[PDB]
Design a protein around this ligand. Structure first.
Ligand SMILES: [Cl-]
Length: 139
């Protein structure tokens, strides 16, 4: 299966778990300082997983385009607050892990390693859904 063949939320969950074992993916200790479930406890892993999937889907894609995609105005020169820092750090860690690269004049793209990483996890998830859902009791 590929990323296209599984739901995004469950894929990001499963990718997040696998990213925990990748040494370069190091939570920056930003989310714990916010007061305003695994997706919260493991926020950074989910964030990086989501961004990796977004690069797979949308690449080539630039930092500012990702920032505005995720944000709650395009201004690539402007001094990044929290959202820009998140994209930048995620992309730095993903590049260090070999999963994304920069293409001059194009943006970030997923590498063959990154693509296979996602597609392997998608294949596992697809198999699980195919097994579990049809076998659930009705009532
Ligand atoms: Cl964090």
């Amino acid at each position: 299966a590929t990323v296209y063949d599984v739901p995004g939320d469950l894929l990001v969950e499963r990718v997040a778990q696998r990213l925990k074992e990748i040494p370069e993916i190091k939570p920056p200790e930003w989310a714990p300082f916010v007061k305003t479930l695994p997706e919260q406890e493991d926020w950074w892993y989910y964030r990086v997983a989501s961004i990796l999937r977004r690069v797979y889907l949308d690449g080539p894609v630039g930092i500012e385009r990702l920032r505005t995609y995720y944000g709650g105005g395009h201004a690539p020169e402007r001094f990044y607050k929290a959202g820009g820092s998140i994209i930048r750090k995620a992309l730095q860690q993903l590049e260090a892990a070999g999963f994304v690269e920069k293409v001059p004049g194009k943006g970030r793209v997923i590498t063959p390693k990154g693509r296979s990483f996602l597609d392997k996890i998608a294949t596992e998830l697809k198999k699980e859904l195919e097994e579990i859902i049809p076998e659930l009791k009705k009532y």
